[PDB]
Design a protein around this ligand. Structure first.
Ligand SMILES: CC[C@@H]1C(=O)N(C)c2cncnc2N1C1CCCC1
Length: 285
C-alpha cells in the first residue's frame, strides 16, 4: 500500500505488520525517496478522539523528535492524513530485551554489562536534555540487526520539573514504581535510576525485586524498599543493585557512578554480542 503525506508529497510504502503497540498498529514503512525502511506506528484518529489522549501522542512526538543519540531510538518523521497518525522510527530487527529475557530467563554477567552500559549511555543523554523517560523496562530496550540497544517508547516521558511545581500523581502505569512516586513526591531522575536497578535485578534473576501489578497492596513493600537479595548474585552485582534501589532517592548513585561501579570495571564485557544471545547462553570468557 502506498501512503502519501498530504502535507509534502512524499510517498511511503507500507510493509509487513510488526504487531500492536498500545494505540498503534505497527508496520514496516519505506520512505520511497531514500528507499530506507522504518518501524512505523499507525494510530487511527478514533484512538485519539479524547483531548487528553490527543495531548498524549503530541507530547510523545514533541519530546521524541528532538532526540539524536546512538542509544536512543531515532525519531525519523511524523505526519497525519484524514485517517491516521504515522510515526516513523528507527527499525530494530531483533525486537526487544523483553523477548530476549523471555527466551533466556536469565542473562550472563558480561551480557548484563553489555546491555546496561548502552541503557546508561542513552539515559545519560536524556537526563542531560532534562527529559525523564518514566517507563524504563525491558520491552522498551529495542535491539537492532547489529545487536545494539536503543531506548525507546517515549509515551510517558516528560521534561524534568522542580519538586515545588512537580506533578505528584502516578503518571500512566509504569513497570517499576519508585518509593518517592508512591510517597507522592513525583518522578525525578532518581526514579529512572530505581527502574534501572529493577531492570538489572530482572536481567540477572529473571523476575523483578518487587511485584509489578501496581496494586495498592504492593505499595508498602516498595516504599520500604525491602526485598529478597538472592545468594546467587555475585558480590559486586549485589552491591550495585542495593545502591540503585536505595529507599531514599538522594542515596542512589549517579549514572557516571553506576558505569564506574566494580560490577562493570572488574568484569569482562564484549564490544559486540552475537545474535545467538537472543536464544542461547554464550560461551565462557
Ligand atoms: C514501532 C513501535 C516499537 C518501537 O517503538 N520501535 C522503535 C521499533 C523499532 N523496530 C521494531 N519494532 C519497534 N516497535 C514494535 C512494533 C510492535 C511492538 C513494538
Amino acid at each position: 500500500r502506498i501512503i502519501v503525506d498530504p502535507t509534502t508529497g512524499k510517498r511511503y510504502s507500507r510493509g509487513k505488520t510488526l504487531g500492536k503497540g498500545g494505540f498503534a498498529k505497527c508496520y514496516e514503512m519505506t520512505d520511497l525517496t531514500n528507499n530506507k525502511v522504518y518501524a512505523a506506528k499507525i494510530i487511527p484518529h478514533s484512538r485519539v478522539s479524547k483531548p487528553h489522549q490527543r495531548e498524549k501522542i503530541d507530547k510523545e512526538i514533541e519530546l521524541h523528535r528532538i532526540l539524536h543519540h546512538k542509544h536512543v531510538v531515532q525519531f525519523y518523521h511524523y505526519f497525519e492524513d484524514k485517517e491516521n497518525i504515522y510515526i516513523l522510527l528507527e527499525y530494530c530487527s531483533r525486537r526487544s530485551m523483553a523477548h530476549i529475557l523471555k527466551a533466556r530467563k536469565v542473562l550472563t554477567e558480561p551480557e548484563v554489562r553489555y546491555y546496561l552500559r548502552q541503557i546508561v549511555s542513552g539515559l545519560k543523554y536524556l537526563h542531560e536534555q532534562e527529559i525523564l523517560h518514566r517507563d524504563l523496562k525491558l520491552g522498551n530496550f529495542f535491539i537492532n540487526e547489529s545487536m545494539e540497544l536503543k531506548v525507546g517508547d517515549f509515551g510517558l516521558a516528560a521534561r524534568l520539573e522542580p519538586l515545588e511545581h512537580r506533578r505528584r500523581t502516578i503518571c500512566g502505569t509504569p513497570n517499576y514504581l519508585s518509593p518517592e512516586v508512591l510517597n507522592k513526591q513525583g518522578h525525578g531522575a532518581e526514579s529512572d535510576i530505581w527502574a534501572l536497578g529493577c531492570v538489572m535485578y530482572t536481567m540477572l534473576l529473571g523476575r523483578p525485586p518487587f511485584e509489578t501489578t501496581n496494586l495498592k497492596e504492593t505499595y508498602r513493600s516498595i516504599r520500604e524498599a525491602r526485598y529478597t537479595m538472592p545468594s546467587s548474585l555475585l558480590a559486586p552485582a549485589k552491591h550495585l543493585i542495593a545502591s540503585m534501589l536505595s529507599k531514599n532517592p538522594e542515596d542512589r548513585p549517579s549514572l557516571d557512578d553506576i558505569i564506574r561501579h566494580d560490577f562493570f570495571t572488574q568484569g569482562f564485557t564484549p564490544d559486540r554480542l552475537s545474535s545467538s544471545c537472543c536464544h542461547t547462553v554464550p560461551d565462557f570468557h
